[model samples]
Target: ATVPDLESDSFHVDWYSTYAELRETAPVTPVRFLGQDAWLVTGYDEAKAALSDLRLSSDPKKKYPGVEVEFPAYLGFPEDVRNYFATNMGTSDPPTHTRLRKLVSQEFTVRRVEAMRPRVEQITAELLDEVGDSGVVDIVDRFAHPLPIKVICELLGVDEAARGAFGRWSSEILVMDPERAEQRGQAAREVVNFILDLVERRRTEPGDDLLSALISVQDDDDGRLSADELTSIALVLLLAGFEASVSLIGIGTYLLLTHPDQLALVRADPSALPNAVEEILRYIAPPETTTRFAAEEVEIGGVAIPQYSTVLVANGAANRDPSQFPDPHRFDVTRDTRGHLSFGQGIHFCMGRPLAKLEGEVALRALFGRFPALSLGIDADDVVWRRSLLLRGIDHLPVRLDG
Candidate 1:
């Protein structure tokens, strides 16, 4: 049987159509990814089902006889270092994931996130001012990148944006660039070291921030987390919380710029902005896919999988599945986007989702509010996509504010 490779140009350059072709055969297909045999779930129904199924483990370290794969093997770090860094909710399963989820959940509840609305609004204003009122500017560099970094860090009490080093190191860690395997490990170390310092600082200067709260949780452990867990959790909170916001704001703005009709719909009515955010997420959610592993033998969409097989839920595919959303390819701000799985589903659903959505809505609404004449600085065909293993954002969204 021929297996699809997710890393291929066919998939990378044009994933929507590629997933369309794959799902035509069957929703569940076999693929090779990150040096492992895996199943890819591309249909809306199957993808959602797989995500909610606890039998399919999220942690890559789930070991069976003859199976021993670790999460994020592309880092090229020593096993001890890899295990240390991979210890977080996104890379964990069960009781630990349950525990970690509860801790972070308390901080990100809708009511709490709603309170941050004023601060988020103020941050958007500052970012736009930094980018200026006119001329060609790369939104990715000027607006999208810093907004989340500043928001998340400040929310966590990290204070400094530190975005230059922070962005580069996080990108290297994120890309899992197999071609540059050695540098990937180096980058991971860079992040770990930085977080170590921050965690230590928070231990002494405990404040009303997420990092301080996390440290307190370890001390207030209904159940305890080790030192590494504390450091790793902070790392995940920083990166995972806002990774997609950058993409959402960047890609969301890009989509709007190219589609004036849809853009005008929101511009005509601010009430439509909420629906527009949902549509943007459904249309081009980041990371492209989320991974899981079959705990044992199982069947998905008529495909038989061996024990310990890796499974990938193409969330983007699910969001765009024609059966779920009518005219799935067409971008419409007013379209009903009720069941989109952009933030995922089940126990492992994205924890930072509320914060991410809040950021996107504020950034986009504030962006157009500031520059009604926002237009792409370069041709649509010339837009460059970031080469990340787990995200789907543009490299540089050059746009002329046209003031």
Candidate 2:
């Protein structure tokens, strides 16, 4: 059954029946989407195989020989900005991807992410404390959202006050609506201006932070990131570092609260957070759709996909493949949930995974600890889910924290 578009962003993928149907009927079939015709790769084993296939390259130029725009232009970046993003991590193929990833990949390791654990825990505790005495609070605003934004602000060394303004600007930039184009363009200027200011400051007085580190990153002892490249990566890290985590926290908290049994089990033991995070990411259809362009003729599930066709990999669909993940719809944290494609597989996998997981673990751990009696203020039927094929999240979660 199709659900209503809860948020005005866009349509959310019909995750419930879509996955099951895709797995059986059109596992690797040609499908048209987002005004571009592409092949949707569903099913777990097949999707993983395709992602890890050495034949595939994230390199835009090599991947899409004829396509003019190798990367999304809405990123509010100059030419080099687009090139750096693709060549760096998300869009570059191996060799280039390997070289680019090495520039700053060590920064995202478990040990590095864990170093923020104490700070994350403290941030969670403080946010929870602020919502005290109010039995009912919007979990998204009160706790799930702000923590990561704060963390990113510190990590990127951006002023805390700038986040409130930049966050709004970031949203406008993400929306593709033509009506908001002018406004978004202005917002982009604001962001670029802010970034320029930061660059100037960092140059004169460098700090021990990601921004400084990025500014100083060198590739092959020759290729260093340019000013524009530095700015684009910083913006990507700033927005992605927090925005995605907020969605996970909001959705993850809602699931845990509704599923009391899981909550109880987790309360008894805190170690379940990581697996639970994986399950939530896989189960939730947030970032419902992602895009890729075919570099060359590739055969997927016996379907010969032509070169230059846009490929939309639905992590939302692939995560729930019944054949690979037993009882795929069931939200069992203890299940073998590793290798989930919620972060996408292969070279383009999410660079902020460590930060996202840390935030989710800390956010949920503190939520349950502080509000042991907390329950959703409204029934599941009443909750509004964000209606964006690109971003899935609970609209507003009114939870009785002290009840």
Candidate 3:
């Protein structure tokens, strides 16, 4: 059988069914990625194992022996750009990963994230106010896109004047399309330079914000984040800050509107919004997959994976695996979705989940509260999913706010 094109629009639209077929047959199927052989883990257990396994290293240089031959370089980015991503908390193994994570983890603690609740609600309201009486709007552009970006800006102390550029550069670089390599490279350079300058500015004039705090952080060992590391961390936080939430809000809203029974549940009881958000994360699985490289030869789901082999953990498939979630394909907000891999698993699990969840819950309540009669302006079948392998989200969602 021909392997499905993972980045194709058809695959994103019908991913659950495609992965379901893969799960029962070749749970650890081998496939080519960016012109190289790799394994795609479809089973929930196998995916969880791969994510948590130390045997699977995230550091590309360790697995590939040289960074130039990896995805970043293959995608036409500079060597410095390659190192920027490869050395961050998300891409490094311990003690580098542990150290990098420790420096920034304090800012995203439960208490810290909870403290942002009022501001989160305020941002949601302010964005909605801007859409006041506009009867019809593309929520993805008007609402979903701006909410998280504003929150990240406020958290990082980024000036409002620069948020627009931040959003454009982020969108340009994050998409995994080689055809736009030059644009992506330019955007990457601009964003990194902007961040480096911002870091310098934060040093001379610190503010009562996360970025300032990160700037001044020093460990007991007297070790400090290098300038490159600081720029890399900033890039990771800023990019991840809004990317996943964009997917959650767009895909979640789409799911809720289509499942009116679920939508009504949240509408009737606003407190159920949190649980509803969790259910949406599980059902939609915003982050489709994350890559890991085999540190050594290993066996997963009875299949032998060679050393240095690239492994793609299908979180989308894992979240819907019948072994974990009963009637897995159904979109029900009332179900318990505590263990879904939507935000991922293991040590590298999403550090900004609390903030993301807060945005999602607040956005949903504020949106539906103001526009109780909100409904899609276009046919459900006409919705477009972004064609990307790493992320899954609606490109645009036209909705009518009038009753």
Candidate 4:
């Protein structure tokens, strides 16, 4: 018997075709490939259930002993990734996550995000004005990418001067090119050391930023996080806040350009921006896969999921499942797509959801309102998707906006 690898065995498995076939064929079924056996769930309802199941362990290090991964591993940090997972938050279960969530969750709650609306709108306006002299520009470079980075910097009290330097590091880590292993490792070291230094600075010249708050936080059990843990938590929140929004902005702009009709609808009524954003998320949902190890033997889609087996949930498939969203392939903003999993679901749902929604809605709405006649300068097919499987977005999108 040989070690089985099911994922890449059969099927073209590119972004769109997999879901299309799933919609027509068995939505959930066991498959053998890459010389391994695993259950593939393509139905929206089935994926949602797997995501929410308590029997599924979010941490792979603890559950799946059988599966082999290369270190500086594809999943991330070789060793505990330095308390960067936040003492135990990212890797630990309830009570730990419960306590950790309490510390930072409130500040990112719906109210806080709503409060940022005016500023976000103002930022969008300012950026749009900067691009007016030359209405044609690369949307990703000019508008989509930087906005979230700036916003997250302000949120975390990061020094403005360091943006360009660290932004590059962030991008390298995101692309995760193994060939550039030495370069990426060096960049991670710089970022970690940078966070450590910032933490020390905040201790003395404490500001009203999220990083300072995390440093000063005391859990109900009178627990305070260690230095390494604090650094990890800060980095995690910092990356999560900006990365998702960056991708959303890229994909959102791409969506509007490709579907000029919906763009017009959005420009006509800014309120429709939310639905448009939702549709954009559904259309270009990131990461074909998110995995969790089985904490206990569990049944998923009628298959017996053995304890400790790695269960990979496909977020892209879930969002695009035709049974859940009629004619999912078509780009329609007016569609009632309330339960999309682009942001994920259950206890581990994206913590920055509120902020992401606010930033996306405000920035995207302001984009259209300011550039009512924006059109892609290059052919739509020329746009390239990011190589990382964990994220869904384009590398660059060039467009010309009308005055």
* Total clashes in model 1, counting residue pairs 3 or more apart in sequence or in different chains: 1
Assess candidate 4 and give its TM-score to the true structure. Answer: 0.87
Off by over 4 Å in 1: 72-74, 161-163, 218-221
Would you list the C-alpha lDDT of every candidate in the order shown? 0.81, 0.71, 0.82, 0.71
**Which parts of model 3 have CA positions greater than 4 angstroms off?**
1-4, 8-10, 63-69, 72-74
Per-residue alpha-carbon lDDT of model 1 for 1-403, expressed as tens digits?
7888777887778678989999878899888866766788899999988888888887765567776765544357766557656788887888889887777666556886788889999988998888877799888888998889888887777765455676887777667657788888888788777788888988988998878776756325646556788888888777776778899999999999999999998999988998999899999978678877788777777777777777888898888889999889999999999888888888877777778888988999999989998899989988888765478788688899974
Q: What is the lDDT of residue 211 in candidate 4?
A: 81
Cα-based RMSD of the predictions, in order?
2.0, 3.8, 1.9, 3.5
- On the 0 to 100 scale, the lDDT of residue 340 in model 3 is 91
What's the TM-score of every candidate structure? Answer: 0.94, 0.87, 0.95, 0.87
- Tell how far residue 341 is off in model 3, in angstroms: 0.6
Superposed by TM-score, candidate 3 places the C-alpha of residue 81 at a distance from the truth, in angstroms, of: 1.1
lDDT of 3 by residue, 224-336 (tens): 77887887888778888888999999998898889899999988888888999999999978778888878789899999998777788989889989999999999988898
Q: Write the per-residue lDDT of candidate 4 for residues 1-403, one digit (tens) a residue.
A: 3322333323323556755675456655655433345556677887899988877766434524555522222324444443454354555567666766776664556775676778787787878788774556888888888888888888788887777677777776765455676676666766777777777888889887778777777766637767766776787777777877888888888888788788878777777888888888888786556666567788876677776565667687788777788887889988997898887888877777778888888888778766667788888777767766466567678788873
When 1 and 4 are scored with lDDT, the better candidate is 1
Residues forming the 10-long window of minimal summed lDDT in candidate 3: 65-74
Better of 3 and 4 by lDDT: 3
